[PDB]
């Protein structure tokens, strides 16, 4: 059996000085099942590769343990030398389709059963049989969620800075004209004090109408001050979370909201056949990044507004770090499975055992104890 180091499902960790790994416990106190892992010491190429004994554990390995207990299996788990699920590469005489990774190892006889997170595609299923899926997770939209804050940070009126000068000159001219009209059939500052006290909330016939018109002038100022703040507050929403591929925001990508794939993920192949995504391809091709780790680092660094990847990784990253929250309902859903050879006689028994475990609620307990950790 060969397995790939997948952080949400496979926790590959080095052993101790005694050759075995330390035994930990979960939140419920149950011991963590571990199996001796065999694989190369260095994943990167051009290194003195050594098949040192590692120690891997997780949800898929727990499922493998259950299958071994219920189906009379004795297994030794391995690691992928190439480090990829397996596609078609180009070699001398490129007109020959040669597999790599897990699929190539299975077809070459190196492995006999693959219990890991391998997606079920028609091209993969043409030569390698797949079993019943464990759980169905389709790729979603990942965006960064930030604490809401008011965007009305401004001084000297929202947009008309001359309004303060206008009201100042108005309160000066009304005061001077009140002083002028006072000498008719209260000398230095009483008019200005009264004007300030009637404009703000603080303690013959010409005076009455003057006070009425100045009160009317004061009312509209505070009315506009409340109205602009209310408008800013009701428009204070930064953006609305993407509900899926049908969101009009995604259909017209711009410089204000950039999102793209990595390079040639089963995602790029799917988008190639979609002729209706010409607008998508006119913008996503200029924002591709070399690796998913680099892409998610850029997203965390406020470089890419949104990132598109399988839910099995994005949801785990969101659970681990609350700085990112997965959005979108679902689109282009797929499922996992077990990679077995076409002549393997274990197909029916493996399918029956997986169905029985799924109906017994074991899958939900494993998801709770291995996928969803410290929900934000």
């Amino acid at each position: 059996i060969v397995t790939i180091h997948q952080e949400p499902f496979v926790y590959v960790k080095p052993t101790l000085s005694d050759g075995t790994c330390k035994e930990e416990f979960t939140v419920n106190g149950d011991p963590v099942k571990k199996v001796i892992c065999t694989g190369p010491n260095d994943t990167s190429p051009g290194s003195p590769r050594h098949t040192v004994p590692q120690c891997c554990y997780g949800f898929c390995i727990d499922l493998l343990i259950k299958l071994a207990r219920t189906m009379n299996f004795t297994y030794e788990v391995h690691l992928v030398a190439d480090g990829k699920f397996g596609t078609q590469e180009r070699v001398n005489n490129s007109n020959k389709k040669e597999w790599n990774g897990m699929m190539g190892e299975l077809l070459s006889g190196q492995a006999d059963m693959i219990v890991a997170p391998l997606t079920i595609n028609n091209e993969r299923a043409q030569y390698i049989e797949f079993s019943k899926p464990f759980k169905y997770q389709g790729l979603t939209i990942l965006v960064k969620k930030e604490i809401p804050r008011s965007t009305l940070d401004s001084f000297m009126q929202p947009f008309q800075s001359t309004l303060w000068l206008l009201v100042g000159l108005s309160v000066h001219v009304v005061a001077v004209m009140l002083y002028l009209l006072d000498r008719f059939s209260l000398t230095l500052s009483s008019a200005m004090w009264f004007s300030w006290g009637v404009l703000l909330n603080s303690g013959s016939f010409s005076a009455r109408i003057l006070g009425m018109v100045w009160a009317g002038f004061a009312m509209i100022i505070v009315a506009s001050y409340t109205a602009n703040l209310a408008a800013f507050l009701v428009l204070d929403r930064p953006e609305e979370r993407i509900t899926g591929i049908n969101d009009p925001r995604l259909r017209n990508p711009s410089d204000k909201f950039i999102y793209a794939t990595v390079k040639q993920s089963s995602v790029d192949i799917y988008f190639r056949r979609q002729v209706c995504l010409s607008t998508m391809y006119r913008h996503m091709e200029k924002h591709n990044y070399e690796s998913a780790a680099e892409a998610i680092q850029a997203v965390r660094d406020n470089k890419l507004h949104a990132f598109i990847w399988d839910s099995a990784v994005l949801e785990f990253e969101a659970s681990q770090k609350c700085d990112l929250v997965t959005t979108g309902e679902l689109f282009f859903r797929s499922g996992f499975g077990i990679g077995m050879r076409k002549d393997s006689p274990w197909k029916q028994n493996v399918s029956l055992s997986i169905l029985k475990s799924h109906e017994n609620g074991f899958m939900e307990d494993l998801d709770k104890t291995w996928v969803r950790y410290q929900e934000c």
């Binding site: 004209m177 009209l181 016939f205 010409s206 109408i209 003057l210 018109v213 002038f217 509209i220 506009s224």
Partner: peptide, 25 residues
């Protein structure tokens, strides 16, 4: 807004008219 200046000018015109009327009375 543009309407605010028009409204305040209309109010000031009425205020000045009333002041002139009460002065000439």
């Amino acid at each position: 807004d543009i309407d605010n200046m028009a409204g305040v000018f209309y109010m000031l015109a009425a205020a000045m008219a009333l002041s002139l009327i009460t002065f000439i009375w």
